[model samples]
Target chain A: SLHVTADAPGAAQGGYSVVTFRVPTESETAATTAMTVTLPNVRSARTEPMPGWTARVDRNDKSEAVSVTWTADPGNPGVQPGQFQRFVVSIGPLPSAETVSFPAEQTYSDGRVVAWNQPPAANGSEPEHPAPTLTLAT
Target chain B: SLHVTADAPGAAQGGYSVVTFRVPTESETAATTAMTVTLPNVRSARTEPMPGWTARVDRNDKSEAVSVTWTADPGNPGVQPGQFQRFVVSIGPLPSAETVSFPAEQTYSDGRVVAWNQPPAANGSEPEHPAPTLTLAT
Candidate 1:
């Protein structure tokens, strides 16, 4: 499970801000080969290009899609199964939020899509699931 | 006994360029506490403020005067003596000329100024005494 936050500190309207996100990894042995992280219902989401990785960007009314594919540059060999990897997604000043959710789906070479979409359980403890959330600061 | 170069890489109207020389030492043993480097015959020279050090700019029509005193941060152990430290000054840009020369003077805490104003001798050997000259490509 990973958490993401995008807030502009003292930023002006139409100004640029950096939105960082964590790349979720399944386990220490599960190397992230490819993944698609979506910014739900945020038309202003613009992901910057990262070096050594191929990123595909698409904008739709429902969400802003950012698909990343690992290159020949071998990933971290120390990663194992049931472990997690973190990544950052930098964007701009977000638009007005209306039921916006940042959903991330990790796709591995072994044909597995780990969806971290559910929130924690009611017992004030995290469920056996993984999903990303956003919090706006005043 | 050290050589250095400083140039304005991408200046349009050609500003000022400066370079400071410092005696180098081992990373662990070096202490750059209250070190001063001087520049002689400097004209229209101005000190530019950097992140960690305070700069003093000076210049005279007949000759330019420039010197900067660096107060080492408690976190950084400073540079070791016998080694060399070079600081670049980029005021503006160069209109023409493939390269430009920037001479410098290095003063140490123990009251020592090393002049690196010229290149090594033609014998493919460094001169017994050396001066700093920075060449900038246009």
Candidate 2:
């Protein structure tokens, strides 16, 4: 449900900016009302405030091992099947690399959380549940 | 936590066999008292009827998608950490194939359900959440 694209929200190689990704529900019978995204080697990351979603952060030493979980409140049906939700966050001076990947967990309303946390394929093939990467152009 | 083993009660090949899986409680930070397992492809299946646990089956066509849940009824403390519970059930004349995998969903007490529902890699690489495989031998 995550991948690098040119159509991201605030993707740039500059000082600081907000990056956005649209995650679609993984299962057709499953509703993805909440998710927890764990940034890979990221610190001091903050998600932009969204009106309908509740955002929470878990801090670690010196920065953030920030686990930003976007949830739908009572009576609010979050993301349904065949639907996509946009999650935007501010993180940067990103990295020296050309692309940065974020490993995330997508939770369904049925209490199932899928771990989409895999690095690139060493065999040069695609890894299943690969991390969402943002291509940075310098 | 093996589904196919010599320790499994009444395990057989070609015809009918009673299979059991010992699911170990995974998290120490959370108590795993109750769990639901969704059985994979099978024409017929039934549980061994544990005294304290409640068993329910979702029947579809000629097969049964069995779900077994265990919880502490008052005097019992349920299943705590460093503990395991055996779920015994009767499944199949599985399939005509020599091997069949029963992908199951293991639910936790705190409402976190772990899915053991992944087929092995096409190239034979093991998956992170692997479903249990039973080798049918005459």
Q: What is the per-residue lDDT of model 1 for residues A1-138, given as tens digits with 9 covering 90 to 100?
A: 343232334333333345455554554433444444554323354445555344334433244432222211222222235554444455545444422345555443222335545664567776555455454443
Number of the predicted model whose lDDT against the real structure is largest: 2
Give candidate 1 regions above 4 Å deviation. A1-17, A61-86, A92-100, A123-125, B1-138
Residue B14 local lDDT, model 1: 42
> What C-alpha lDDT values do all the predictions have?
0.41, 0.58
Candidate 1 true-interface contact recovery = 0.00
Candidate 2 chain A: worst-modelled 10 consecutive residues by lDDT: A1-10
Best by DockQ: 2
Q: Report per-prediction Cα RMSD to one decimal.
A: 23.4, 9.5
- lDDT for position B80 in model 2: 66
lDDT per residue (tens digit) for residues B1-138 in model 2? 432121344444656777777777777743443444445545676777677555444443344443333333322345666777777777766555666666665544333557777875568686777776777766
